[PDB]
Design a protein around this nucleic acid. Structure first.
Length: 311
DNA sequence: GCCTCGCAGAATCCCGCTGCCGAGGCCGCT
DNA sequence: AGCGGCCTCGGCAGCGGGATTCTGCGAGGC
């Protein structure tokens, strides 16, 4: 079973994270990832780097525990791994103050919202998780990615309901027949969007090196490089850039963002000739959000997304 | 004696949207 | 002067499971 606060008191790891800077219940199930579930209150669990992670939040600290194989006191290198995963070197209070000074709508939204953060995931993990998250509700994608991880991932242990697996290796998905096999599992057409976006990594773009060299490249170059891949449009390209490549200038634009804009901000496509999902409208909204907010507008977008979901 | 209220069961919407199909702009050369 | 076709636009629609939202059916009792 998933570890509870009274399960194994010597199997935790505390890191400094105030509740004003971050809130677990508003970030992880808020579309940004699809490998974390809740069983007990204020608990989350998902596999990263072939290791099961369980996260909970106290008033001023974040508590962590791991499943691998029979050892406690997780090593500080994984603490730095989750620190990079959670942008703990970044401060959000000053960013909230900046946004409230420039625009009072974000302050009114954040009058009860304190700490909608963003993550920084592995690009293979985040990319393949967000392939099958297009035109799809969160719970379906969560079960969807869990079933894919069961089918193609190295399992760890059956933890009282369902086995947990490492996220599938890139050699496991770049083969043939995988589209039909995952369509049997129920990925929909996204299965094709996985297959065409697996071999293209290793057979036509240059392997894992081409993708891993994009974490220090320029914005538009990396954006177009991800957009060339099949199934990775501008929304998931910006999602990968923001949550796997450390590009805080990127604002994801989706159904929630556009409903929020058209109902709260009175923004309409000026240069564009329509009001429907389109790359020009996405670029216009990105430029507008960057100009009105600044260089870190994706984080304010994340707060807006968490506000949209819990309402 | 039929019509208000409940009530179970289909229909449709929806959800963190890309690939392909219409379309102007830019070149093309009669 | 005459219209063919490359290149980023705009509009859906493909894939499932859960909510709404309609959509017809029993009891009734004024």
């Amino acid at each position: 079973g998933h570890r509870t606060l009274a399960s194994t008191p010597a199997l935790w790891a505390s890191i400094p994270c105030p509740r004003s800077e971050l809130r677990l219940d508003l970030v992880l199930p808020s579309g940004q990832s699809f490998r974390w579930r809740e069983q007990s209150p204020a608990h989350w669990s998902g596999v990263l780097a072939d290791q099961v992670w369980t996260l909970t939040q106290t008033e001023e600290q974040l508590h962590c525990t791991v499943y691998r194989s029979q050892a406690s006191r997780p090593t500080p290198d994984e603490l730095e791994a989750v620190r990079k995963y959670f942008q703990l070197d970044v401060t959000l209070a000053q960013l909230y103050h900046h946004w409230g000074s420039v625009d009072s709508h974000f302050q009114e939204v954040a009058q009860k919202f304190q700490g909608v953060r963003l993550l920084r995931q592995d690009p293979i993990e985040c990319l393949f998780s967000f392939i099958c998250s297009s035109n799809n509700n969160i719970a379906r994608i969560t079960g969807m990615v869990e079933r894919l991880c069961q089918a193609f991932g190295p399992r760890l242990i059956q933890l009282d309901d369902v086995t947990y697996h490492g996220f599938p290796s890139l050699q496991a998905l770049a083969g043939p027949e995988v589209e039909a096999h995952l369509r049997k599992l129920g990925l929909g057409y996204r299965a094709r969007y996985v297959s065409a976006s697996a071999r293209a990594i290793l057979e036509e773009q240059g392997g894992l090196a081409w993708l891993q060299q994009l974490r220090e490249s320029s914005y538009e170059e990396a954006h177009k490089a991800l957009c060339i891949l099949p199934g990775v449009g501008t929304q998931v390209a910006d999602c990968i850039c923001l949550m796997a490549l450390d590009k805080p200038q990127a604002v994801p634009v989706d159904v929630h963002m556009w409903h929020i804009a058209q109902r709260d901000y009175s923004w309409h496509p000026t240069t564009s000739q329509a009001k429907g999902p389109s790359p020009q409208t996405n670029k216009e909204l990105g430029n507008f959000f960057r100009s009105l907010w600044g260089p870190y507008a994706g984080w304010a977008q994340a707060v807006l997304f968490s506000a949209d979901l819990r309402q």
